[PDB]
Amino acid sequence: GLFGAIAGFIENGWEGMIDGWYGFRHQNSEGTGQAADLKSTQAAIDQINGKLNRVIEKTNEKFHQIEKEFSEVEGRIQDLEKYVEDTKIDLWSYNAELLVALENQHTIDLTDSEMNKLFEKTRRQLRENAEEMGNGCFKIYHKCDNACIESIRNGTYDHDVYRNEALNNRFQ
Amino acid sequence: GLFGAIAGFIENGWEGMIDGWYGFRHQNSEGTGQAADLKSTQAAIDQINGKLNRVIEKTNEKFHQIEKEFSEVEGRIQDLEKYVEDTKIDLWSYNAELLVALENQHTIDLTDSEMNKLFEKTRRQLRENAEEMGNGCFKIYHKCDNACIESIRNGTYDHDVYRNEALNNRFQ
Amino acid sequence: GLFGAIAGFIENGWEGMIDGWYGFRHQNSEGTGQAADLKSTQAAIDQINGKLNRVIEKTNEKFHQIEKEFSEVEGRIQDLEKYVEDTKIDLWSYNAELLVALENQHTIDLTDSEMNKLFEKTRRQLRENAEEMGNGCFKIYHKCDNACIESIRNGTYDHDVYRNEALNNRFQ
Amino acid sequence: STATLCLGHHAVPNGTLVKTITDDQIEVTNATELVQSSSTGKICNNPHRILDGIDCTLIDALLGDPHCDVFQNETWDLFVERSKAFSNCYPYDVPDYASLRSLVASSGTLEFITEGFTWTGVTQNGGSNACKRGPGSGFFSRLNWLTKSGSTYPVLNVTMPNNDNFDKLYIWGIHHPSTNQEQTSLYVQASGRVTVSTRRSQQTIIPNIGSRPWVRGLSSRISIYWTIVKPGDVLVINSNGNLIAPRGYFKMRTGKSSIMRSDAPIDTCISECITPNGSIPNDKPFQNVNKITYGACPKYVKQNTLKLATGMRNVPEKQTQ
Amino acid sequence: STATLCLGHHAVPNGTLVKTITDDQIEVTNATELVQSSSTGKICNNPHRILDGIDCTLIDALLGDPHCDVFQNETWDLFVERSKAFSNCYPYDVPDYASLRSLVASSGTLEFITEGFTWTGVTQNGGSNACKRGPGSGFFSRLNWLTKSGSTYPVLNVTMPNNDNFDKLYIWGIHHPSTNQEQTSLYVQASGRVTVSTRRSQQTIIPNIGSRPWVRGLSSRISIYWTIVKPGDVLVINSNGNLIAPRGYFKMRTGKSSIMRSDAPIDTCISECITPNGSIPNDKPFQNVNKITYGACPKYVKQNTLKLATGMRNVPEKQTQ
Amino acid sequence: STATLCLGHHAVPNGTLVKTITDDQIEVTNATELVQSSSTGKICNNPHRILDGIDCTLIDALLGDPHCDVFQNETWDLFVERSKAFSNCYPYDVPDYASLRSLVASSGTLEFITEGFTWTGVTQNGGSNACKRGPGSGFFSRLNWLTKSGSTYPVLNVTMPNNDNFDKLYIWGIHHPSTNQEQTSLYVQASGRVTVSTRRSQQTIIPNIGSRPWVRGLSSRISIYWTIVKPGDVLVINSNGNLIAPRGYFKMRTGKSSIMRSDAPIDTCISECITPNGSIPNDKPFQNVNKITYGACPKYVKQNTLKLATGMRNVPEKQTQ
Ligand SMILES: *[C@@H]1O[C@H](CO)[C@@H](O[C@@H]2O[C@H](CO)[C@@H](O[C@@H]3O[C@H](CO[C@H]4O[C@H](CO)[C@@H](O)[C@H](O)[C@@H]4O[C@H]4O[C@H](CO)[C@@H](O)[C@H](O)[C@H]4NC(C)=O)[C@@H](O)[C@H](O[C@H]4O[C@H](CO)[C@@H](O)[C@H](O)[C@@H]4O)[C@@H]3O)[C@H](O)[C@H]2NC(C)=O)[C@H](O)[C@H]1NC(C)=O
Ligand SMILES: *[C@@H]1O[C@H](CO)[C@@H](O[C@@H]2O[C@H](CO)[C@@H](O[C@@H]3O[C@H](CO[C@H]4O[C@H](CO)[C@@H](O)[C@H](O)[C@@H]4O[C@H]4O[C@H](CO)[C@@H](O)[C@H](O)[C@H]4NC(C)=O)[C@@H](O)[C@H](O[C@H]4O[C@H](CO)[C@@H](O)[C@H](O)[C@@H]4O)[C@@H]3O)[C@H](O)[C@H]2NC(C)=O)[C@H](O)[C@H]1NC(C)=O
Ligand SMILES: *[C@@H]1O[C@H](CO)[C@@H](O[C@@H]2O[C@H](CO)[C@@H](O[C@@H]3O[C@H](CO[C@H]4O[C@H](CO)[C@@H](O)[C@H](O)[C@@H]4O[C@H]4O[C@H](CO)[C@@H](O)[C@H](O)[C@H]4NC(C)=O)[C@@H](O)[C@H](O[C@H]4O[C@H](CO)[C@@H](O)[C@H](O)[C@@H]4O)[C@@H]3O)[C@H](O)[C@H]2NC(C)=O)[C@H](O)[C@H]1NC(C)=O
Ligand SMILES: *[C@@H]1O[C@H](CO)[C@@H](O[C@@H]2O[C@H](CO)[C@@H](O[C@@H]3O[C@H](CO[C@H]4O[C@H](CO)[C@@H](O)[C@H](O)[C@@H]4O)[C@@H](O)[C@H](O[C@H]4O[C@H](CO)[C@@H](O)[C@H](O)[C@@H]4O)[C@@H]3O)[C@H](O)[C@H]2NC(C)=O)[C@H](O)[C@H]1NC(C)=O
Ligand SMILES: *[C@@H]1O[C@H](CO)[C@@H](O[C@@H]2O[C@H](CO)[C@@H](O[C@@H]3O[C@H](CO[C@H]4O[C@H](CO)[C@@H](O)[C@H](O)[C@@H]4O)[C@@H](O)[C@H](O[C@H]4O[C@H](CO)[C@@H](O)[C@H](O)[C@@H]4O)[C@@H]3O)[C@H](O)[C@H]2NC(C)=O)[C@H](O)[C@H]1NC(C)=O
Ligand SMILES: *[C@@H]1O[C@H](CO)[C@@H](O[C@@H]2O[C@H](CO)[C@@H](O[C@@H]3O[C@H](CO[C@H]4O[C@H](CO)[C@@H](O)[C@H](O)[C@@H]4O)[C@@H](O)[C@H](O[C@H]4O[C@H](CO)[C@@H](O)[C@H](O)[C@@H]4O)[C@@H]3O)[C@H](O)[C@H]2NC(C)=O)[C@H](O)[C@H]1NC(C)=O
Ligand SMILES: *[C@@H]1O[C@H](CO)[C@@H](O[C@@H]2O[C@H](CO)[C@@H](O)[C@H](O)[C@H]2NC(C)=O)[C@H](O)[C@H]1NC(C)=O
Ligand SMILES: *[C@@H]1O[C@H](CO)[C@@H](O[C@@H]2O[C@H](CO)[C@@H](O)[C@H](O)[C@H]2NC(C)=O)[C@H](O)[C@H]1NC(C)=O
Ligand SMILES: *[C@@H]1O[C@H](CO)[C@@H](O[C@@H]2O[C@H](CO)[C@@H](O)[C@H](O)[C@H]2NC(C)=O)[C@H](O)[C@H]1NC(C)=O
Ligand SMILES: *[C@@H]1O[C@H](CO)[C@@H](O)[C@H](O)[C@H]1NC(C)=O
Ligand SMILES: *[C@@H]1O[C@H](CO)[C@@H](O)[C@H](O)[C@H]1NC(C)=O
Ligand SMILES: *[C@@H]1O[C@H](CO)[C@@H](O)[C@H](O)[C@H]1NC(C)=O
Ligand SMILES: *[C@@H]1O[C@H](CO)[C@@H](O)[C@H](O)[C@H]1NC(C)=O
Ligand SMILES: *[C@@H]1O[C@H](CO)[C@@H](O)[C@H](O)[C@H]1NC(C)=O
């Protein structure tokens, strides 16, 4: 019954994250909290919407074409007509199949990428004041209350102010 | 005649790795060893097989179509027939060319990715007890025999037990 | 009026970099300098040229085909002719659209990748003698004149010779 | 004292499966359908002018089969032919029927201009009980059945110049009597002929004598032919028997008109895309409803579903016992 | 004391080149071929019913050219026409030959039902030395050569109703004599005619007098025509000369049948895909063997090879001197 | 003392927008156009042999319309038909004109071999004032207008064997007189016929009597037909009137020849690709100039521009105030 312990994105999702796609969970002196990251969440959503608005846009308007069903057997000309339509349909079916496979592969990759990019940026902020636990979580080597955590999340964290306290905890 | 010295994956392959796609080489107190990583090796193989089973699967069954060779000159109708088939063939030839180019580009990228992912995970395990030499190899800053190496490979390495010995070697 | 201060590639380009695609800017004891990296620049250009030489190469040579404009109304056969050509044109227009979208997406990604790869390699050289400022720039924690910077750029930097001086600046 | 900051992404309890280059089955958080697979079963009469042929084919509307009289001078973006349609005039066939149907359907109009044709020496306005209009015998409204007058049928030789700026479509026919007795009672000569010509085209038909299957009282037949006359050009009709004469021309247009075979009911609603199944929405790039479409339609495709991922990979949360 | 842990990937001494978006030539560790470029040269007779026409075209099997008698009431998934095939009956031509061949090949069957046709006033079962069956003169097995009786050839007028649930295919012909003397010796009238009709279709042919090239003894010709009769509909044949009469109908089917021109030998083996080159395997998505295929076949493609990478980039191991 | 080493990429002041899977608009540093959208308006006469038909259609060059005499025995890779072209010989029509034009254009040659045809009992070399060559009446150079001699027109029956290794193309015609008086003044018989046959093909045409529109003096017409004779096979011509006789055959070839309708001027320059708009370069994979092309051409596409990125994303440099 391991409860209360938090873990990051490494082979792990969060069903409790409802106000964002990506975000933070923390354990500090003041307990346990969670907050969504709007920027990374927005970045992914925008990319999804870009792809969607490219595919769902611009219908082809067609009018008089060729007949495609036939009540009589005729031979050569009808053979050619059916073959033309069947050729066309197989080619568009192929394009449709390939399109969604490529788009979905890219969707999964861009969303993984956003997660990783948020992780790298957070690490960049932390400098020498934190270590990577290897589970998508950082061990902050200093007192970091809710305001300290928030400064990391809102990108104004000042690593110098904690640096000396952190090195002593890390090394000594 | 530089022999015995080992190097990692940076612009470098291993012809002696035969029981795996990815893996470890080490130099410790007990000499020199090598071991394949089954997980990463398996991950890549599965992805290769997924792509293969999507392409090699589901043949199209066709029956009565149009004639495609002709013993007589006829003009208009035969022009159209040949043009239809030639149009179809060029389009499928294009799909075939594009398909393998995309798949092979993605194959190379996913296999590079697996290598990098194994490297990052190994670094994550090592924490502050090792440094990256920049050749795909880690310098372990503590006594690490064959059992220590194996614990890194089988993912049960306990960095705390070596941490203090490592920092002294690294820093002091 | 913040002038003279340099920043890296993080959400930032350099309009003054004209002799390369990727490169270095530095601030040391001897002032401020800039130098292009030929290798990474060349790598990207080669990949761009590979894609270009695959697309611009091998024109299709066609001769006698079908008529595509008509001075008389005829009905069925002409319906089929126009429909065949219109089917063909829409399919090639689709291939054209998809091709450039894929190629441009991949172009942008491979060029971003080259930038990141240059950054990782530079970090690898620096070992424990530098820290990542989080703006695409390194803070070198030792005296590093123009010859020291150049040794980093030309890939012969000896981190041992600066290591002890760097740790004292970093930690103590 | 320390702190733990974890980074992670969301996941849902109701994931959905999509395809990639690699997997047949990846669960992601959200997905959208790209294949329109459904229709209401009704054809919307907005914004395309839909013309319900009801009991009439386009060809029967063209000729003037009496129970199709309601369709005179009619126009359409899409003509709709029903399976309940029936012919109820003179037994006829159209060589290359499909081409005539096509070109008229594409023209999009049955605008007919009566022309002052002069048929000297012959009886006009022939009728049949196979083609009733009102109580008595009748004929195709757009055709003129010519027969002998007295005991003579002269060599008809007439002209109609096109001095307009559009193309004229002429519909004419040839009578095939069932007996030699019929062949001489109407047209005197033992074998008639019909020659219709412009300066660059000619069609001569020699009528055939013979019993055909009984249709609405008759074993005789009429074969329908057409002639297009460009501006500057001219029409000439020459015959010594069996001419089923035109009464004028149909005005030809170019544009977006077509024809569709469907039994789907017409409804007061709005839709750009029409299938024989009925109208379908065009919000999705693809559709599996029908390869036959008219208007702004999704492309027909064999797959009944294609799922585009609109969210990240759905990954379950870990819990240690 | 320290330790060195290196991470690396495998490489092989026998790499192979593939293409990407970028490179024309990347060496990878392993690759598989996607283009089937080879055939055994033999057509497998499993699982498709293959019918070797041997010396007979499908059309000659249809009509009843004596040396094709073995093919009566025959069926097939794929009919195979050989280059060695020859006609050895009455000299004939088929207007729109390709369409007749196509529709019969697609129907997939030569199931013939003899019908009790009644030809009053005329001689039946005409034969020729150009079409021998056994020792003496003969004719197409499915056709009935009608000529005058006494010094008269009456106006033939017959009916065959289709009260079945399938389509009937009728094969009939018109005789073209080489001389006016021939034209009056057989059929009395100076010019015959043949009218075959349903309620919605009619074909009238007027025979042509003239010397054609000498073929198997003859300068006369027979032209072959066909008529399909739907259920509920009815056949009517009317002629006063030159009628080459049907003896019944062919049962029409819909399905997977086709025809192929090939000289490839039939073999006892198993294969879904058939080319004129012979059977090919269908494990690869593409093939370069022939654009002409039948069955579950890879898609035809212009490339003779396409290599799919099945391994990582092959990178050589470094050694310092 | 420390140091700061920054890594960064270039950017330009003149960026350009491209498309990706994601964005309609990404600015990158450099891009290249993939759609050829422009033509000089001129057709280059290198390296394809271009033949300017000037005032002559290919068909009129084929037949021997006098003002097209300059085109005898001519060859081409691409024949160019002008809108200014006019016929100035006997009023004629060609059933399936498009097929004759096509096959001759593809053959690529008007190489004509005169054959020693023998027409016994008839007058040869008929001429008309509708087809002048020099001061007096004339006719198509490749055709021979046959009429009665004395008061008789015998049954013509001739042979031309093909003992060459190539296919012979025969061009022949049927005269349609405007009056019965014309029909008996030239050919004696009340109704002529023309039968042209090989061992596997026959075409019989019965001329039609009737007034057609006045063209260059005439209301009569000639209908043009063709016959291909394979090696080993043989030609037979049979007629008792209205035969417009061939004077030999055209040598048929297979190859890269075609035909194009264009008013673009021919110019001394070099280009592989030809459109009716004029020559276009083939350095780009796609073109938007014309769907009609000949030679090594980019593929036709609906987009007027497609921009391939040839550089990285263009990112602006930051400056703090
Ligand atoms: C699973 O994944 C899918 C992703 O596909 C996702 O579904 C998507 O959810 C989106 C968010 O809600 C939704 O987008 C919205 O669509 C609204 C529809 O109204 C308009 O649709 C037209 C499209 O044809 C559009 O052009 C037009 O603006 C429509 O409104 C107006 O025009 C029409 C006719 O032109 C007229 O009849 C209307 O009356 C007129 N409106 C009015 C008021 O008169 C949008 O309106 C909506 O807009 C929102 O964003 C805008 C800017 O971004 C703001 O201006 C606005 O205020 C809103 O905030 C929004 O764009 C997608 O339609 C939907 N896609 C599908 C396929 O269903 C799921 O949500 C996701 N699930 C989860 C759990 O994440
Ligand atoms: C270079 O790269 C290529 C990658 O393309 C790689 O080649 C691949 O190697 C694979 C590994 O050996 C190989 O996969 C194997 O195929 C076996 C073939 O048998 C079966 O093939 C059918 C395909 O149509 C399959 O559906 C069916 O199971 C076949 O067997 C059975 O059915 C048939 C008819 O349906 C019947 O006639 C047989 O009698 C019947 N079998 C029996 C016993 O009655 C597979 O059998 C084999 O299975 C293995 O894996 C399974 C689970 O993964 C296990 O169940 C099983 O025990 C085996 O362990 C395996 O899947 C690919 O075919 C091959 N591809 C190509 C294109 O050649 C190279 O190896 C690589 N080189 C290097 C050096 O890496
Ligand atoms: C924005 O992005 C675009 C990227 O598309 C970029 O534009 C590209 O710039 C390239 C660099 O200048 C340029 O490439 C050059 O093309 C030269 C053209 O000459 C040759 O072109 C033929 C192509 O059909 C080629 O096959 C042949 O070699 C041509 O020369 C010779 O053959 C022809 C006929 O076959 C004959 O008529 C000529 O006489 C004969 N030459 C001689 C001397 O007799 C190349 O010549 C040039 O070569 C350079 O590189 C070679 C090795 O890489 C060296 O051998 C050589 O010395 C040169 O250094 C080079 O390849 C692209 O053409 C151009 N593309 C487009 C679409 O315009 C922009 O520069 C970029 N902008 C920025 C700011 O980055
Ligand atoms: C060449 O051969 C064809 C085919 O054999 C012949 O065509 C047939 O022609 C006859 C008449 O000439 C058709 O027979 C029937 O005629 C009836 C009308 O005449 C009858 O009506 C009066 C009352 O008004 C009766 O007292 C008296 O018996 C008359 O004979 C129609 O009412 C018939 O309709 C039938 O068919 C329908 C549908 O099939 C049924 O529902 C009806 O109940 C009824 O049974 C019918 O038309 C006959 O139909 C024709 N057959 C075909 C196939 O067309 C040619 O006449 C012949 N030519 C020559 C010169 O001999
Ligand atoms: C209109 O014009 C056409 C073409 O010119 C004429 O058609 C030709 O008709 C003649 C016969 O009428 C064909 O001539 C040959 O007939 C031989 C049979 O008759 C001969 O046989 C006896 C013995 O049984 C001999 O003693 C005697 O000479 C008879 O004359 C065939 O055996 C011939 O075969 C030849 O051709 C083959 C292949 O080409 C060779 O291998 C043979 O060895 C042999 O040389 C031949 O058939 C002649 O072939 C016809 N030509 C064509 C092109 O069809 C029409 O007759 C004419 N019409 C009118 C009314 O005049
Ligand atoms: C069946 O019906 C058709 C159509 O109605 C008739 O065809 C017409 O035939 C007549 C002549 O038979 C054509 O009339 C004109 O003939 C002129 C030549 O003859 C005249 O020339 C002398 C001097 O040489 C005059 O003194 C005298 O009036 C003669 O009558 C041509 O010069 C005419 O050209 C006209 O047309 C052109 C372009 O349209 C104009 O630019 C000219 O200025 C001039 O007006 C003209 O050809 C008449 O054109 C024919 N019509 C058609 C549609 O073809 C058949 O004759 C008729 N058949 C029977 C048996 O009755
Ligand atoms: C989170 O980011 C916001 C926005 O940058 C910071 O905003 C401050 O919010 C405080 C409330 O605690 C206000 O009184 C100040 O006016 C804001 N400061 C500035 C400079 O805008 C906020 O400080 C950040 N969170 C923490 C804990 O520092
Ligand atoms: C490598 O991983 C395996 C599997 O996790 C570890 O398994 C132990 O193997 C030893 C043999 O040396 C057994 O006696 C134990 O039963 C296993 N332990 C557990 C917890 O399953 C193994 O320890 C790892 N290698 C090293 C060197 O530690
Ligand atoms: C930059 O790299 C170059 C090439 O590796 C180094 O080349 C040396 O250049 C010096 C000039 O300062 C020459 O005298 C030497 O002959 C070169 N040395 C070698 C080993 O080739 C250069 O040293 C590097 N830059 C710095 C500052 O070290
Ligand atoms: C999951 O359920 C929620 C609420 O029931 C719904 O809004 C959402 O669309 C569902 N997602 C999927 C992929 O079904
Ligand atoms: C058909 O149109 C003509 C002229 O356009 C007109 O004279 C005639 O009355 C119209 N017929 C009907 C039924 O509207
Ligand atoms: C390399 O050689 C081995 C053994 O000879 C063989 O199994 C393997 O398929 C070869 N690989 C390639 C790519 O040829
Ligand atoms: C052909 O089939 C019919 C009926 O199906 C049958 O009467 C006849 O004998 C068959 N002929 C042969 C040669 O089997
Ligand atoms: C930008 O300008 C330079 C010089 O004016 C030019 O060489 C280059 O091609 C331009 N780039 C673009 C993308 O227009």
Secondary structure of D149-205 as H, E, C letters? ECCECCCEEEEEECCCCCCEEEEEEEEECCCHHHHHHHHCCCCCCEEEECCCCEEEE
Query: Quick check: CB of D40 below 6 Å from ligand 1?
Result: no
Q: Which residue is listed with tokens 């197409």? A: E140
Nearest by CB to residue E8, choosing from B17, B90, B133, is B17
In whole angstroms, what is the distance from residue C11 CA to residue C2 CA? 18
Query: Quick check: CB of D236 below 6 Å from ligand 6?
Result: yes
Contacts of D237 (CB under 8 A, 6+ apart): D156, D157, D158, D160, D172, D194, D195, D196, D243, D245, D246
In whole angstroms, what is the distance from residue D150 CA to residue D131 CA? 25
The candidate with the shortest Cα–Cα distance to F247, out of F112, F108, F49, is F112
Q: Do the Cβ atoms of D98 and C76 come within 8 Å? A: yes
> What SS3 state is found at E144?
strand
- What is the chain B residue with the closest CA to D25? B50
In whole angstroms, what is the distance from residue F86 CA to residue D200 CA? 12
Tell me whether strands F258-261 and F31-33 are parallel, antiparallel or unpaired: unpaired
Cα B153-B159-B161 angle, rounded to 5 deg = 120
The candidate with the shortest Cα–Cα distance to C157, out of C142, C137, C135, is C142
Contacts of F143 (CB under 8 A, 6+ apart): F63, F64, F171, F172, F173, F244, F245, F246, F247
Q: Do the Cβ atoms of E98 and A76 come within 8 Å? A: yes
For atom 6 of ligand 12, the residue with the nearest CA is E14
F47: preceding bond cis by omega (within 30 degrees)? yes
In whole angstroms, what is the distance from residue E207 CA to residue D52 CA? 45
Nearest by CB to residue B73, choosing from F96, F98, F228, is F228
Q: How many CB atoms lie within 10 A of CB E74?
A: 18
E15 within 8 A of E28, measured Cβ to Cβ:
yes
Q: How many Cα atoms within 13 Å fall on the side-chain side of residue D205? A: 23
In whole angstroms, what is the distance from residue A100 CA to residue B47 CA? 18
- State CA D48 to chain mean position distance: 15
Q: F114 burial class (0-12, 13-18, 19+ CB within 10 angstroms)?
A: exposed
Contacts of F214 (CB under 8 A, 6+ apart): none
B18 within 8 A of E11, measured Cβ to Cβ:
no
In whole angstroms, what is the distance from residue A103 CA to residue A119 CA? 24
Q: Is B83 on the interface with C (CB under 8 A)?
A: yes
> What SS3 state is found at D123?
strand
The candidate with the shortest Cα–Cα distance to F298, out of F45, F78, F76, F38, is F38
Query: Quick check: CB of F214 below 6 Å from ligand 6?
Result: yes
What are the residues facing F156 on neighbouring strands? Answer: F239
Which residue type, as a one-letter code, is found at position B134?
Answer: G
Q: Which chains touch D (3 or more CB pairs under 8 A)?
A: A, B, C, E, F
Contacts of A109 (CB under 8 A, 6+ apart): none
Tokens representing E247? 């003896």
F176 within 8 A of F221, measured Cβ to Cβ:
yes
Q: How many Cα atoms within 13 Å fall on the side-chain side of residue F287? A: 26
The candidate with the shortest Cα–Cα distance to D178, out of D130, D141, D110, is D130
Q: Do the Cβ atoms of F23 and A50 come within 8 Å? A: yes
Residues of D in contact with E242 (CB under 8 A): none
Taking the CA atoms of chain B, what radius of gyration do you get in angstroms? 27
A118: enclosing H helix or E strand: helix A76-126
3-state secondary structure chain F: CCEEEEEEEECCCCCEEECCCCCCCEEECCEEECEECCCCCCEEEECCCEEECCCCCHHHHHHCCHHHHHHCCCECCEEEECCCCCCCCCCEECCCHHHHHHHHHHHCECCEEECCCCCCCEECCCCEEEEECCCCEECCCCEEECEEECCECCCEEEEEECCCCCCEEEEEEEEECCCHHHHHHHHCCCCCCEEEECCCCEEEECCCCCCCCCECCECCEEEEEEEEECCCCEEEEEECCCEEEECEEEECCCCCCEEEECCCCEEEEECCEEECCEEECCCCCEECCCCCCEEEECEECCCCCCEEECCCECCCCCCCC
In whole angstroms, what is the distance from residue D195 CA to residue D177 CA? 18
Tell me whether strands D43-46 and D168-176 are parallel, antiparallel or unpaired: unpaired
In E143-259, which ranges are continuous DSSP H helix?
180-187
In whole angstroms, what is the distance from residue D260 CA to residue D267 CA? 16
> What SS3 state is found at E204?
strand
Interface A-F, measured as beta-carbon pairs within 8 A, has a size of 14
In whole angstroms, what is the distance from residue B137 CA to residue E4 CA? 7
The candidate with the shortest Cα–Cα distance to D94, out of D261, D225, D220, is D225
Query: Quick check: CB of D234 below 6 Å from ligand 6?
Result: yes
In whole angstroms, what is the distance from residue C34 CA to residue B161 CA? 45
- Please give the DSSP secondary-structure letter assigned to residue D318: P
- Please give the DSSP secondary-structure letter assigned to residue D109: B
Residues of F in contact with C22 (CB under 8 A): 7-10
B79: enclosing H helix or E strand: helix B76-126
As a dihedral over the C-alpha atoms of residue F300, residue F303, residue F308, residue F312, rounded to 10 degrees, the angle is -170
> What SS3 state is found at D38?
coil
Helix axes B76-126, F97-107, angle to 10 degrees: 70
Tokens representing C44? 């990207």
Q: CA separation (Å) from D6 to A24, A121, B110, D318, E185?
A: 6, 13, 27, 14, 107
- Please give the DSSP secondary-structure letter assigned to residue C150: H
Residues of D in contact with C73 (CB under 8 A): 103, 167, 228, 252
Q: Is F304 on the interface with C (CB under 8 A)?
A: no
The candidate with the shortest Cα–Cα distance to F311, out of C14, C50, C48, C109, is C48
Q: Which chains touch B (3 or more CB pairs under 8 A)?
A: A, C, D, E, F
In whole angstroms, what is the distance from residue C12 CA to residue F40 CA? 43
> What SS3 state is found at A63?
coil
Taking the CA atoms of chain C, what radius of gyration do you get in angstroms? 27
F195 within 8 A of F252, measured Cβ to Cβ:
no
Q: Which chains touch C (3 or more CB pairs under 8 A)?
A: A, B, D, E, F
- Nearest ligand, CA of residue E142? 13
Tokens representing D268? 């007061």
Give the CA diameter of chain D: 126
Q: CA separation (Å) from F275 to B87, B126, B130, F84, F281?
A: 19, 67, 68, 18, 11
Nearest by CB to residue C137, choosing from F6, F256, F320, is F6
D218 within 8 A of D90, measured Cβ to Cβ:
yes
D47: preceding bond cis by omega (within 30 degrees)? yes
In whole angstroms, what is the distance from residue F236 CA to residue A122 CA? 93
Q: Whats the size of chain D, residue-wise?
A: 321
In whole angstroms, what is the distance from residue F121 CA to residue B14 CA? 95
In chain C, which ranges are continuous DSSP H helix?
38-55, 76-126, 146-153, 160-170
Shortest Cα distance, chain E CAs vs residue A36, angstroms: 36
In whole angstroms, what is the distance from residue F213 CA to residue D229 CA? 12
Tokens representing B153? 């490979």
Tokens representing B7? 């190097």
D163 within 8 A of D262, measured Cβ to Cβ:
no
Residues of B in contact with F102 (CB under 8 A): 75-76, 79
Q: Give the right CATH number for B1-172 from 3.40.50.10440, 3.30.565.10, 3.90.20.10, 3.40.190.170.
A: 3.90.20.10
In this structure, the residues whose C-beta lies within 6 A of any atom of ligand 4 are: D 211, 213-214, 219; E 157, 159, 234, 236
Q: How many CB atoms lie within 10 A of CB A62?
A: 18
Residues of A in contact with C131 (CB under 8 A): 127-128
F46 within 8 A of C46, measured Cβ to Cβ:
no
Contacts of F127 (CB under 8 A, 6+ apart): F136, F137, F138, F139, F145
In whole angstroms, what is the distance from residue A86 CA to residue A100 CA? 21
Q: Which residue is listed with tokens 């030789």? A: D157
- State CA F300 to chain mean position distance: 21
Q: Is C172 on the interface with B (CB under 8 A)?
A: no
For atom 27 of ligand 9, the residue with the nearest CA is C147
Can you spell out the DSSP letters for D223-263?
EEEEEEE-TT-EEEEEESS-EEEE-EEEEP--SS-EEEE--
In whole angstroms, what is the distance from residue E293 CA to residue A83 CA? 14
The candidate with the shortest Cα–Cα distance to E28, out of E40, E17, E19, is E17
What are the residues facing F169 on neighbouring strands? Answer: F228, F250
Residues of F in contact with D199 (CB under 8 A): 91, 212-213, 215
> What SS3 state is found at C104?
helix
E315 within 8 A of E63, measured Cβ to Cβ:
no
In whole angstroms, what is the distance from residue A123 CA to residue B124 CA? 13
C48 within 8 A of F311, measured Cβ to Cβ:
yes
The candidate with the shortest Cα–Cα distance to E16, out of E301, E268, E233, E308, is E308
Residues of A in contact with B102 (CB under 8 A): 102
D318 within 8 A of A87, measured Cβ to Cβ:
no
Q: CA separation (Å) from D1 to A29, B128, B162?
A: 8, 19, 22
The candidate with the shortest Cα–Cα distance to C96, out of F273, F294, F305, F26, is F305
C67 within 8 A of F81, measured Cβ to Cβ:
no
The candidate with the shortest Cα–Cα distance to E245, out of E125, E73, E91, is E125
D225 within 8 A of D172, measured Cβ to Cβ:
yes
F51 within 8 A of F274, measured Cβ to Cβ:
no
For atom 5 of ligand 11, the residue with the nearest CA is D113
Which residue type, as a one-letter code, is found at position C132?
Answer: E
Query: Quick check: CB of D203 below 6 Å from ligand 1?
Result: no
E27 within 8 A of E316, measured Cβ to Cβ:
no
E47: preceding bond cis by omega (within 30 degrees)? yes
Q: Do the Cβ atoms of E213 and F195 come within 8 Å? A: no
Q: Is C94 on the interface with A (CB under 8 A)?
A: yes
Tell me whether strands D35-36 and D286-287 are parallel, antiparallel or unpaired: parallel
In whole angstroms, what is the distance from residue F308 CA to residue F287 CA? 14
Q: CA separation (Å) from E168 to A71, E94, E198?
A: 15, 19, 12
Q: CA separation (Å) from B160 to A5, A28, B165, F248, F305?
A: 20, 22, 10, 103, 61
In whole angstroms, what is the distance from residue E170 CA to residue C117 CA? 77
Tokens representing C150? 């150049």
D107: enclosing H helix or E strand: helix D97-107
E40 within 8 A of E292, measured Cβ to Cβ:
no
- Nearest ligand, CA of residue D118? 6
Nearest by CB to residue F208, choosing from D159, D193, D199, is D193
- Interior/surface letters F207-229, b for 16+ CB within 10 angstroms, e for the rest: bbbbbbbebeebbbbbbbbbbbb
In whole angstroms, what is the distance from residue F60 CA to residue E265 CA? 49
Shortest Cα distance, chain B CAs vs residue F102, angstroms: 6
Query: Quick check: CB of E83 below 6 Å from ligand 12?
Result: no
E252 within 8 A of E110, measured Cβ to Cβ:
no
For atom 2 of ligand 12, the residue with the nearest CA is E14
Tokens representing C95? 């291939």
Q: Residue B43 — φ and ψ, nearest 5°?
A: -55, -50
Residues of C in contact with D100 (CB under 8 A): 75
F262 within 8 A of F53, measured Cβ to Cβ:
no
B23: enclosing H helix or E strand: strand B22-28
Which residue type, as a one-letter code, is found at position F214?
Answer: W
Probe target for ligand 6 pocket from F176, F214, F218, F219, with the most ligand atoms within 8 Å of CB: F214
In whole angstroms, what is the distance from residue F143 CA to residue A23 CA? 89
Q: How many CB atoms lie within 10 A of CB F112?
A: 21
Contacts of C103 (CB under 8 A, 6+ apart): C51, C55, E21, F308, F309
- End-to-end CA gap in chain D: 28
Taking the CA atoms of chain E, what radius of gyration do you get in angstroms? 30
Q: Backbone dihedral region of D156: left (phi > 0), alpha (psi from -120 to 50 degrees) or beta?
A: beta
- Whether the CA torsion E60, E62, E64, E68 is positive or negative: it is positive
Resolution (angstroms) equals 2.4
Q: Which residue is listed with tokens 């010709």? A: E221
Q: How far is the CA of D126 from the centre of ligand 11 (A)?
A: 22
Q: Is C35 on the interface with F (CB under 8 A)?
A: no
In whole angstroms, what is the distance from residue D11 CA to residue E250 CA? 65
Q: Is F21 on the interface with A (CB under 8 A)?
A: yes
> What SS3 state is found at D119?
coil
